[PDB]
Chain A
Amino acid sequence: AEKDEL
């Protein structure tokens, strides 16, 4: 699952 946060 691609990380969309920092």
Chain B
Amino acid sequence: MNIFRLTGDLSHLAAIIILLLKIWKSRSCAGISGKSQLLFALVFTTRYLDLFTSFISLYNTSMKLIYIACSYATVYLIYMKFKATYDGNHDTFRVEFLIVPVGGLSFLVNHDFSPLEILWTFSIYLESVAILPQLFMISKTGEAETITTHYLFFLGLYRALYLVNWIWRYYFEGFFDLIAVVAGVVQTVLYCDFFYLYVTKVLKGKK
């Protein structure tokens, strides 16, 4: 552990809680992509299968369990509890164009041809494009509410901090994972326009 990954993890937990508490308190999931939340739940489900083969630390186990619980609870609030406010008509990204190719790529390009590693690879490639349905919904509909932009800011900052974490670990530990890195760069690049607009408009009380 280093400060960059810790801040990265804390930023990710912040985004997850901001969204869950926003839907819970308002009793509405207006402007939220249910599709992106399904993809994030699929990411945690396929990545954390090691919970049954490995113990890293109490922190690592707890964070995995918290991410799974909060992602499944967010999906529950959108598609079941507050389904009356789910804007299905505007959440129209065809997620088959993400899942089917990412699925194909994880089987073909991985560190090892074994079920657990292939599923971990799938979680890494899928996370890189998981926010696309949400950004697509915002571009279709009229802008984004301020709390929704704060969610997007902490989520985007999380994997950007993971890139800094990987520079650190490469320098001090000689550790590198090109699959996680390339996918992490893809994940961050997709937030470029949102970041520019959040800093120039949202942080200046515009949009």
Contact = CB atoms under 8 A, between A and B. Distances in A.
Nearest to B13: A6
A5 B4 CA distance: 12
If over half of B's interface residues share one DSSP class (helix, strand or loop), that class is named, otherwise mixed; here it is helix
If over half of A's interface residues share one DSSP class (helix, strand or loop), that class is named, otherwise mixed; here it is loop
Interface residues of A, number: 6
Interface residues of B, number: 15
Contact of A6 (B54, B60, B111): B60
Interface of B: 5, 9, 12, 50, 54, 56, 60, 63-64, 67, 111, 120, 162, 165, 180
A-B interface, 3 closest residue pairs, ranked by CB to CB distance from nearest: A4-B56, A6-B63, A2-B54
Interface of A: 1-6
A6 B50 contact: no
A3 B67 contact: no
Contact of A2 (B12, B56, B63, B162): B56
